[PDB]
Design a protein around this ligand. Sequence first.
Ligand SMILES: NC(=O)C1=CN([C@@H]2O[C@H](COP(=O)(O)OP(=O)(O)OC[C@H]3O[C@@H](n4cnc5c(N)ncnc54)[C@H](O)[C@@H]3O)[C@@H](O)[C@H]2O)C=CC1
Ligand SMILES: C[C@H]1CC=N[C@@H]1C(=O)NCCCC[C@H](N)C(=O)O
Ligand SMILES: [Mg+2]
Ligand code: NA
Length: 259
Amino acid sequence: MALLTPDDLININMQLQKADSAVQEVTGLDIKGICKALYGTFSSSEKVGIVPVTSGNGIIGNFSASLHAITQYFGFDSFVTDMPDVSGYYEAVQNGAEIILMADDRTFLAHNLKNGKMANNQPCTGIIYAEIASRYLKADSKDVLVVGLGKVGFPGAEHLVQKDFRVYGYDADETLLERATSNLGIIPFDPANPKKFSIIFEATPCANTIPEAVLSENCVLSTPGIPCAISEELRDKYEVQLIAEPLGIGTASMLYSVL
Ligand SMILES: NC(=O)C1=CN([C@@H]2O[C@H](COP(=O)(O)OP(=O)(O)OC[C@H]3O[C@@H](n4cnc5c(N)ncnc54)[C@H](O)[C@@H]3O)[C@@H](O)[C@H]2O)C=CC1
Ligand SMILES: C[C@H]1CC=N[C@@H]1C(=O)NCCCC[C@H](N)C(=O)O
Ligand SMILES: [Mg+2]
Ligand code: NA
């Protein structure tokens, strides 16, 4: 399974700053503006309780600290509980948390206790990175390539289909590809018969998944995938506009979706 390491989260404030500038360049909107477009919501210092969780692989170094910073960055009044797990959840609620933010190895959720809304990181991440890609100001095309049609990728593709884009899809697992084509109506992408895209969305845990043949100059590559979907070489060569950030954008999508 594809879990963060502590090194992925180093200087999360800078990673967020850089991602937010890239998002502004690409779409004319900052991350808050994207979330406002997606969900119509804005932050008003809602209290967010962040609960460390020890199950499975356990507490990931820098994870709760990064969420603490991300939440503050978007204007939430956040805190991290002293205790983990159920004791931590009790602490969070007792200290007045309106939104609970917590994750085990399989599920990262946000639960707004005031209105009952609950978000899962996987669809929220897919949706927001697909939204960003979709809003590329200089795209001059409704064609989009989605690489990776799993838990993050499938909802991203679904979002793009709802937005009336012409969605091409590829997954290395043939069964996943088939699932997407027959449930979403996407066009299966044929790697042996590529075409160029100005808009690309990638959601795999693998490097170098985007072939050169698919790139156009200045195309947007919006990717929650870790590590990076393209080499530095190809990024520089085609002046690719990369939106890639390990936790904060997806977390913002969760939070603004439950407001
Ligand atoms: N940046 C962020 O905020 C977040 C990042 N992620 C990351 O997103 C990635 C995807 O997560 P999930 O969708 O949950 O994983 P998943 O395992 O559900 O789906 C990944 C898909 O990519 C496909 N794939 C793998 N190698 C490929 C290749 N070379 N070419 C085409 N397809 C390939 C797999 O067949 C699989 O269907 C992971 O690396 C995960 O860590 C996940 C959540 C939030
Ligand atoms: C990109 C992230 C967000 C969702 N999946 C990836 C992930 O690493 N999930 C596992 C998070 C586990 C956190 C850990 N239980 C903790 O509380 O420190
Ligand atoms: Mg992110
Ligand atoms: Na990747």
